Design a protein around this nucleic acid. Sequence first.
RNA 1: GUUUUCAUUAAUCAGGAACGUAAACUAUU
RNA 2: CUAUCAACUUUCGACGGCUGGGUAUUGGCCAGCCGUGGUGACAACGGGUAAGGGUUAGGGCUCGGAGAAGGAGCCUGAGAAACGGCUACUACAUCCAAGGAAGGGCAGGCGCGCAAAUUACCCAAUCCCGACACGGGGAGGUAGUGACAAUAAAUACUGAUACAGGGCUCUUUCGGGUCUUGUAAUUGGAAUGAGUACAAUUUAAAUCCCUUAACGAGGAACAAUUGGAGGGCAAGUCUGGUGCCAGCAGCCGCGGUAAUUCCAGCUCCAAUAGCGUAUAUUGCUCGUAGUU
Lengths: 123, 204, 159, 232
Amino acid sequence: SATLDEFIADEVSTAPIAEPSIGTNIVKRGRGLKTAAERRMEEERREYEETNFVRLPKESKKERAKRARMEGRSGRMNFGGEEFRELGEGAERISRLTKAKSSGERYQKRLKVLESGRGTRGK
Amino acid sequence: ARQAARSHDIKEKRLHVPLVDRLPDEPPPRLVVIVGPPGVGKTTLLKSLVRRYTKETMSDPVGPITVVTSKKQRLTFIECPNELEAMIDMAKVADIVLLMIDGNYGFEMETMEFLNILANTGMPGNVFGILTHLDLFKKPSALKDAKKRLKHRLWTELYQGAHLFYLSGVLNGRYPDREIHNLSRFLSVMKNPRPLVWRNTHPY
Amino acid sequence: EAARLDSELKLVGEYGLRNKREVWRVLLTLSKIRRAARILLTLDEKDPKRLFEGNALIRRLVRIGVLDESRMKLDYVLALKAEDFLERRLQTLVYKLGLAKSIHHARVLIRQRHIRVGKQIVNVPSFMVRLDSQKHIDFALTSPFGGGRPGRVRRKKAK
Amino acid sequence: HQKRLSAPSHWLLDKLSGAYAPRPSTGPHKLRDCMPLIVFVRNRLKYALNYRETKAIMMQRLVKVDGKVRTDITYPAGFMDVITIEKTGENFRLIYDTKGRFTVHRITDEEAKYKLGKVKRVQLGRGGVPFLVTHDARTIRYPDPLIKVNDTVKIDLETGKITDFIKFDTGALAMITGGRNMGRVGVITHRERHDGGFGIVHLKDALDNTFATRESNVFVIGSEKPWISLPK
RNA sequence: GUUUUCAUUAAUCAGGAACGUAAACUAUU
RNA sequence: CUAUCAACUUUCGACGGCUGGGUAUUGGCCAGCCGUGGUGACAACGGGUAAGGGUUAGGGCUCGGAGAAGGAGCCUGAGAAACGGCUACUACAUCCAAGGAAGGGCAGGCGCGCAAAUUACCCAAUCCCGACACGGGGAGGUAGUGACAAUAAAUACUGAUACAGGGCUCUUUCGGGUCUUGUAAUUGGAAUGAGUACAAUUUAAAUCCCUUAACGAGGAACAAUUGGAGGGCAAGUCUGGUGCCAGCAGCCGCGGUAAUUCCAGCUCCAAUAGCGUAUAUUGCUCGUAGUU
Ligand SMILES: Nc1nc2c(ncn2[C@@H]2O[C@H](COP(=O)(O)OP(=O)(O)OP(=O)(O)O)[C@@H](O)[C@H]2O)c(=O)[nH]1
Ligand SMILES: [Mg+2]
């Protein structure tokens, strides 16, 4: 339903979407680009940091290897600023959701014509 | 099938040339030599090794020093002085070698000279690189960079993946006892020496 | 084969990439996108799957600036090319905007940290500049072309 | 020493409280139905930051639960226990929400002076005197002779005296404290006996949604009479 | 051939049973 | 999962009821007394050993017997038949003044004579145990190595001048096509990041990250590799033979090592911080079971 949600937010719902400034979604001198999901995750992480203003340890080996095995097993790719997905269970979810939401005058005209005779017998 | 290929390649790595052993049941003390450039503290390493081994604070240890290290085998240490005559003699007679390197200063002609003399006469049983003067560093980035490039150059010198230990400070004028303890852990449990034909044909 | 060799060399020279490794990387991502478009064409028209997925894919390609805004059809998504991706690369974009005299001048500028994309400087030239981000490519504020210090050799000449 | 995820999901911890989570100590409330005092201070209220900070705050006589000073860090305070903090002079009460999570409410002294506790049971104690067991593990000697099981009592909290009582009644409004429909404030409309174990009540909301909860999970709050200030 | 009957009794072959001086140019059509 | 498991139990009572003992309590759990059972073709019993649940768009997440040298017995305690102790036997091992005394686990290295990831730091945060705010934690985090992969990309960018007239290509070759190409030429510009590094920050203390003053490019260097194809050579060497030819080749030549500046850095192809190599490879008829 991800493409569906982006479609509603981009071509349906009447509200502007918050676009960040151009030079702020660059991670490490252009090496990658923060997608919208990782951008929101970074913003949530920064809000936690300011909540009780305790510093966080920059990501450890366990969580780093976990997100590494998830990107190794996933079917996404970040070509530019936007994310591309494989064409499997997401498209199937689109299909399932769409099927599930699909589930007295002509007598007067005839009398006038009949009362009036022909004008041209047959040229 | 690939298990059979791996097993065959391991056995073809296992084979050698059948040389004569000639080692008696009461084996003589194996020769540990300490070789380095002048002013790197081979005498101090000898002091701290013999203190870890026999608990004696030698004030001026000279000549060969015999130590028992197992119930079966015993070693003896000889520091090489800074003369190439002693270097060639002890090089042709050695069995395990501690090659000292002066850390930040990098490699030295004494080290490379001894390595090539050793490999030309006869490659001994064990060679270990020990690397000192690591307190003389100001940035640990420079420290680990020097350690990595020295380990690589030493590997290319003798072989891929040799043992290279690092000795940081000079605490009591002796060495870090934990550092020399793991060093002695490596040079304690030993294997029979490499049976070179010259040592196994002549009595020395 | 000589055809693949001369083709990869033409791409390298006219857009002065470093190696056919970079060329094959662009070819790989082009092939993956083109395969996804092929599967969406295997589906039939007016199916919701093809409709939504193809509209999403065309919108991504437009919003990164490869596909032209005029043609928005999956046949042209098939007709997308590695020449178009390399035109979207950052190094060729510096050379085309005219901050550089040549493509290799653009490459060495991007290496030694003179241009910026928007607010932060950019150290890599394989950056895929989006169409919204294309207009904000200028010299950084710490570069001697943009301002800041007069620079190293100018310093040694002023001494 | 359970993990943060295996900790109950209705006293909330974010994705940064570490892999661990405290376990509640032994006390009046049950283990699953508890909010510990450190989690109430530094995770929900954030009046401190660290375990040592909460240790110091709880070590000086600064946090009072149900009218009594509580010393240790992980004293359980599960449900409808007033928490008076005098340096801010605030009183906090623990209710649930429609989703089924702990919700803290701010109250002054007039409504903070009393508690509302559900009666667990009633018997005769030693000496031939009737005594009354709440769900707060509070025992009241010499009660009103009409207060049966599954009644509710307004408690003075200063002398522990039985100030008032509310009766289990069809046509009364309630709050749910368990089951798959936990935390759905609505009116009791029907009772089903099913003699032989696990009697049921049928409880609809104020807005036409019927569901079946069990009497043990049912917690009578008041016919209309919301004697505690529910959050608006 | 019949102005004759029984109406699947059929087909195939593991196993098995009866019969017993040589070679040397080669559903139709 | 199975009938190449149809009988099983009463072979440690198998099913009862009564009576007690012991257990915290119920109980053939055990002791007496008597009764006759109980299970099974709806799959008992046996055999094989290959020993999941919940959280639902998804994956993720969470939860899941026997022993501490060997039998045997005992002890504390709310919770143990603790392996913590003792007691005797057995099997080991150590000290000694030979009268005596105490004791048993895990981690590491070799395991060919030839090999390759630390014997790192702290309870700083989450959590636990205590007379207890202060004591103690082998969970936990921090650090180091790595070309096994994977990711990004440095080793240079741009002018001016002088001079030379050829550079390249092909089907078709003593033959075609096309026109600006070079130079070990001469000078000019700028840019700098690897590195060096004052600090400040980070943190238990440090590093890394972010900041950051000052340095930091002319080739003879801040020194790109791995393979393949091909040309040119002597007062040299070797081999064949109806003179000079041909072939293999050629660090090796008369002298000369502080001497030589030589094809002065020979040319082309491919990958390029990666690449190469080996091997595996990719007589006839009837007739039963059986079959149609
Ligand atoms: N800080 C520091 N000092 C060292 C280190 N190693 C050696 N030294 C000093 O350098 C000196 C070197 O002395 P030795 O090691 O005895 O030299 P040697 O070759 O063994 O014996 P000599 O023939 O006298 O030179 C020692 O006296 C130390 O004081 C080191 O690792 N760190
Ligand atoms: Mg010496």
